[PDB]
Amino acid sequence: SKSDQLLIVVSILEGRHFPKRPKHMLVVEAKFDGEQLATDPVDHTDQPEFATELAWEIDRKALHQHRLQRTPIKLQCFALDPVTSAKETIGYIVLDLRTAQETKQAPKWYQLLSNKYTKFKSEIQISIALETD
């Protein structure tokens, strides 16, 4: 059943309406079904360039269950200090497999929930898709 092996691919593209923080970086961590993945740290500019794909392995039977159960893909956004190495949680984004098809789809803009930058309507552009593993 090698064919029945799939990848959930989350594409984190660009951010917008972030504050310009000259000494900091941004990192997005993503957690699905107890597996954590992370982006490179990127410049904490107003429009951060994440340009990263994250991939989790899954079975077709398992994927269909997660889809119906609404198992979340939880994205946590951190501001990182390259000097001290301290990370602070900026906000979170929740995705689910409802839209995930086996073709690439147009990305959508997602607002950061519990956003520490309370006056900024910070958001991150995200695609989700399924590929053969």
mmCIF file of all heavy atoms in Angstrom, residues 93-113:
data_model
loop_
_atom_site.group_PDB
_atom_site.id
_atom_site.type_symbol
_atom_site.label_atom_id
_atom_site.label_comp_id
_atom_site.label_asym_id
_atom_site.label_seq_id
_atom_site.Cartn_x
_atom_site.Cartn_y
_atom_site.Cartn_z
ATOM 1 N N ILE A 93 -2.668 30.148 15.028
ATOM 2 C CA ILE A 93 -3.560 29.942 13.891
ATOM 3 C C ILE A 93 -3.920 28.469 13.874
ATOM 4 O O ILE A 93 -3.037 27.616 13.998
ATOM 5 C CB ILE A 93 -2.856 30.274 12.553
ATOM 6 C CG1 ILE A 93 -2.692 31.781 12.376
ATOM 7 C CG2 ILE A 93 -3.627 29.698 11.376
ATOM 8 C CD1 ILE A 93 -1.640 32.158 11.352
ATOM 9 N N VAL A 94 -5.211 28.171 13.728
ATOM 10 C CA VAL A 94 -5.696 26.786 13.652
ATOM 11 C C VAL A 94 -6.187 26.471 12.239
ATOM 12 O O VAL A 94 -6.990 27.207 11.677
ATOM 13 C CB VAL A 94 -6.818 26.512 14.684
ATOM 14 C CG1 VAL A 94 -7.343 25.104 14.549
ATOM 15 C CG2 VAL A 94 -6.304 26.718 16.089
ATOM 16 N N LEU A 95 -5.674 25.389 11.670
ATOM 17 C CA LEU A 95 -6.109 24.908 10.367
ATOM 18 C C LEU A 95 -6.761 23.537 10.538
ATOM 19 O O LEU A 95 -6.549 22.862 11.547
ATOM 20 C CB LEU A 95 -4.912 24.769 9.421
ATOM 21 C CG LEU A 95 -3.907 25.909 9.216
ATOM 22 C CD1 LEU A 95 -2.652 25.375 8.559
ATOM 23 C CD2 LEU A 95 -4.498 27.036 8.381
ATOM 24 N N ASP A 96 -7.558 23.119 9.565
ATOM 25 C CA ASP A 96 -8.003 21.729 9.543
ATOM 26 C C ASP A 96 -7.984 21.182 8.124
ATOM 27 O O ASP A 96 -7.810 21.948 7.168
ATOM 28 C CB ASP A 96 -9.364 21.531 10.245
ATOM 29 C CG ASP A 96 -10.507 22.255 9.550
ATOM 30 O OD1 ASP A 96 -10.618 22.162 8.312
ATOM 31 O OD2 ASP A 96 -11.316 22.906 10.252
ATOM 32 N N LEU A 97 -8.172 19.868 8.003
ATOM 33 C CA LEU A 97 -8.024 19.164 6.733
ATOM 34 C C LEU A 97 -9.262 19.187 5.844
ATOM 35 O O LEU A 97 -9.329 18.456 4.861
ATOM 36 C CB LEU A 97 -7.600 17.723 6.990
ATOM 37 C CG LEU A 97 -6.253 17.568 7.677
ATOM 38 C CD1 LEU A 97 -6.137 16.192 8.282
ATOM 39 C CD2 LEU A 97 -5.124 17.827 6.687
ATOM 40 N N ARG A 98 -10.232 20.024 6.186
ATOM 41 C CA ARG A 98 -11.493 20.104 5.446
ATOM 42 C C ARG A 98 -11.287 20.500 3.983
ATOM 43 O O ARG A 98 -11.973 19.995 3.100
ATOM 44 C CB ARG A 98 -12.434 21.102 6.128
ATOM 45 C CG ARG A 98 -13.883 21.060 5.670
ATOM 46 C CD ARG A 98 -14.718 22.188 6.309
ATOM 47 N NE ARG A 98 -14.831 22.068 7.768
ATOM 48 C CZ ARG A 98 -14.295 22.918 8.644
ATOM 49 N NH1 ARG A 98 -13.605 23.974 8.227
ATOM 50 N NH2 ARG A 98 -14.454 22.714 9.945
ATOM 51 N N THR A 99 -10.341 21.401 3.738
ATOM 52 C CA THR A 99 -10.119 21.955 2.404
ATOM 53 C C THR A 99 -9.023 21.223 1.639
ATOM 54 O O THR A 99 -8.939 21.339 0.415
ATOM 55 C CB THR A 99 -9.746 23.466 2.453
ATOM 56 O OG1 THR A 99 -8.677 23.674 3.393
ATOM 57 C CG2 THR A 99 -10.959 24.325 2.828
ATOM 58 N N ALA A 100 -8.184 20.484 2.364
ATOM 59 C CA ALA A 100 -7.044 19.788 1.776
ATOM 60 C C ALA A 100 -7.453 18.787 0.693
ATOM 61 O O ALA A 100 -8.076 17.763 0.983
ATOM 62 C CB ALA A 100 -6.235 19.100 2.862
ATOM 63 N N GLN A 101 -7.103 19.111 -0.552
ATOM 64 C CA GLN A 101 -7.284 18.222 -1.701
ATOM 65 C C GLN A 101 -5.929 17.702 -2.158
ATOM 66 O O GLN A 101 -4.893 18.066 -1.594
ATOM 67 C CB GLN A 101 -7.933 18.964 -2.868
ATOM 68 C CG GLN A 101 -9.224 19.677 -2.550
ATOM 69 C CD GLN A 101 -9.728 20.516 -3.713
ATOM 70 O OE1 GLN A 101 -9.503 20.190 -4.883
ATOM 71 N NE2 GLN A 101 -10.430 21.599 -3.395
ATOM 72 N N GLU A 102 -5.945 16.864 -3.194
ATOM 73 C CA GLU A 102 -4.719 16.324 -3.788
ATOM 74 C C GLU A 102 -4.230 17.137 -4.983
ATOM 75 O O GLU A 102 -3.505 16.630 -5.832
ATOM 76 C CB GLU A 102 -4.897 14.852 -4.165
ATOM 77 C CG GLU A 102 -4.584 13.906 -3.023
ATOM 78 C CD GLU A 102 -4.980 12.466 -3.305
ATOM 79 O OE1 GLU A 102 -4.620 11.930 -4.381
ATOM 80 O OE2 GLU A 102 -5.646 11.868 -2.431
ATOM 81 N N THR A 103 -4.654 18.396 -5.044
ATOM 82 C CA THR A 103 -4.075 19.400 -5.935
ATOM 83 C C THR A 103 -3.645 20.587 -5.093
ATOM 84 O O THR A 103 -4.098 20.752 -3.957
ATOM 85 C CB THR A 103 -5.097 19.947 -6.944
ATOM 86 O OG1 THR A 103 -6.374 20.080 -6.308
ATOM 87 C CG2 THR A 103 -5.219 19.043 -8.131
ATOM 88 N N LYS A 104 -2.788 21.425 -5.660
ATOM 89 C CA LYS A 104 -2.399 22.660 -5.000
ATOM 90 C C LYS A 104 -3.542 23.672 -5.132
ATOM 91 O O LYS A 104 -4.181 23.771 -6.186
ATOM 92 C CB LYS A 104 -1.072 23.179 -5.565
ATOM 93 C CG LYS A 104 0.075 22.172 -5.402
ATOM 94 C CD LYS A 104 1.436 22.778 -5.703
ATOM 95 C CE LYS A 104 2.554 21.759 -5.502
ATOM 96 N NZ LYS A 104 3.904 22.387 -5.602
ATOM 97 N N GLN A 105 -3.835 24.373 -4.041
ATOM 98 C CA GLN A 105 -4.910 25.358 -4.030
ATOM 99 C C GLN A 105 -4.380 26.739 -3.732
ATOM 100 O O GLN A 105 -3.306 26.878 -3.136
ATOM 101 C CB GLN A 105 -5.974 24.988 -2.997
ATOM 102 C CG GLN A 105 -7.020 24.027 -3.532
ATOM 103 C CD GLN A 105 -8.222 23.901 -2.617
ATOM 104 O OE1 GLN A 105 -8.124 23.372 -1.505
ATOM 105 N NE2 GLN A 105 -9.373 24.382 -3.087
ATOM 106 N N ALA A 106 -5.137 27.754 -4.147
ATOM 107 C CA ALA A 106 -4.806 29.145 -3.838
ATOM 108 C C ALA A 106 -4.739 29.348 -2.318
ATOM 109 O O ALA A 106 -5.609 28.866 -1.589
ATOM 110 C CB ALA A 106 -5.807 30.098 -4.475
ATOM 111 N N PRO A 107 -3.684 30.029 -1.837
ATOM 112 C CA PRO A 107 -3.526 30.231 -0.401
ATOM 113 C C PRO A 107 -4.557 31.218 0.133
ATOM 114 O O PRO A 107 -5.107 32.012 -0.626
ATOM 115 C CB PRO A 107 -2.120 30.822 -0.286
ATOM 116 C CG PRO A 107 -1.911 31.509 -1.587
ATOM 117 C CD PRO A 107 -2.585 30.645 -2.601
ATOM 118 N N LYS A 108 -4.821 31.152 1.431
ATOM 119 C CA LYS A 108 -5.740 32.081 2.068
ATOM 120 C C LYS A 108 -5.047 32.823 3.210
ATOM 121 O O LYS A 108 -4.081 32.328 3.796
ATOM 122 C CB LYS A 108 -6.979 31.346 2.570
ATOM 123 C CG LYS A 108 -7.858 30.788 1.463
ATOM 124 C CD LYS A 108 -9.097 30.086 2.037
ATOM 125 C CE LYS A 108 -9.679 29.072 1.052
ATOM 126 N NZ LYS A 108 -10.343 27.928 1.750
ATOM 127 N N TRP A 109 -5.541 34.018 3.511
ATOM 128 C CA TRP A 109 -5.018 34.804 4.619
ATOM 129 C C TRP A 109 -5.653 34.396 5.943
ATOM 130 O O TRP A 109 -6.869 34.316 6.040
ATOM 131 C CB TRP A 109 -5.259 36.275 4.341
ATOM 132 C CG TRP A 109 -4.310 36.838 3.335
ATOM 133 C CD1 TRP A 109 -4.567 37.114 2.019
ATOM 134 C CD2 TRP A 109 -2.946 37.186 3.561
ATOM 135 N NE1 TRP A 109 -3.442 37.623 1.414
ATOM 136 C CE2 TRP A 109 -2.433 37.680 2.336
ATOM 137 C CE3 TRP A 109 -2.112 37.146 4.679
ATOM 138 C CZ2 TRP A 109 -1.123 38.130 2.202
ATOM 139 C CZ3 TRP A 109 -0.807 37.589 4.543
ATOM 140 C CH2 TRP A 109 -0.324 38.074 3.310
ATOM 141 N N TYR A 110 -4.825 34.117 6.946
ATOM 142 C CA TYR A 110 -5.304 33.726 8.277
ATOM 143 C C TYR A 110 -4.841 34.700 9.365
ATOM 144 O O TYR A 110 -3.633 34.897 9.557
ATOM 145 C CB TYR A 110 -4.809 32.325 8.648
ATOM 146 C CG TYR A 110 -5.421 31.196 7.870
ATOM 147 C CD1 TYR A 110 -4.877 30.790 6.658
ATOM 148 C CD2 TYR A 110 -6.535 30.512 8.356
ATOM 149 C CE1 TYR A 110 -5.433 29.739 5.940
ATOM 150 C CE2 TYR A 110 -7.104 29.461 7.649
ATOM 151 C CZ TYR A 110 -6.547 29.082 6.442
ATOM 152 O OH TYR A 110 -7.091 28.048 5.725
ATOM 153 N N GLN A 111 -5.798 35.280 10.090
ATOM 154 C CA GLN A 111 -5.485 36.129 11.239
ATOM 155 C C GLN A 111 -4.848 35.366 12.398
ATOM 156 O O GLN A 111 -5.289 34.268 12.739
ATOM 157 C CB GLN A 111 -6.747 36.803 11.762
ATOM 158 C CG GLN A 111 -7.091 38.123 11.100
ATOM 159 C CD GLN A 111 -7.931 38.994 12.010
ATOM 160 O OE1 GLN A 111 -9.056 38.637 12.370
ATOM 161 N NE2 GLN A 111 -7.378 40.140 12.404
ATOM 162 N N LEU A 112 -3.825 35.962 13.006
ATOM 163 C CA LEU A 112 -3.269 35.480 14.272
ATOM 164 C C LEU A 112 -4.245 35.671 15.422
ATOM 165 O O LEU A 112 -4.624 36.800 15.722
ATOM 166 C CB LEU A 112 -1.990 36.243 14.613
ATOM 167 C CG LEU A 112 -0.634 35.589 14.408
ATOM 168 C CD1 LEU A 112 -0.488 35.179 12.970
ATOM 169 C CD2 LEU A 112 0.443 36.586 14.800
ATOM 170 N N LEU A 113 -4.631 34.578 16.072
ATOM 171 C CA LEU A 113 -5.473 34.647 17.267
ATOM 172 C C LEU A 113 -4.629 34.856 18.534
ATOM 173 O O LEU A 113 -3.475 34.432 18.582
ATOM 174 C CB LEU A 113 -6.350 33.395 17.385
ATOM 175 C CG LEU A 113 -7.069 32.935 16.104
ATOM 176 C CD1 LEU A 113 -7.536 31.500 16.222
ATOM 177 C CD2 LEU A 113 -8.230 33.874 15.727
#
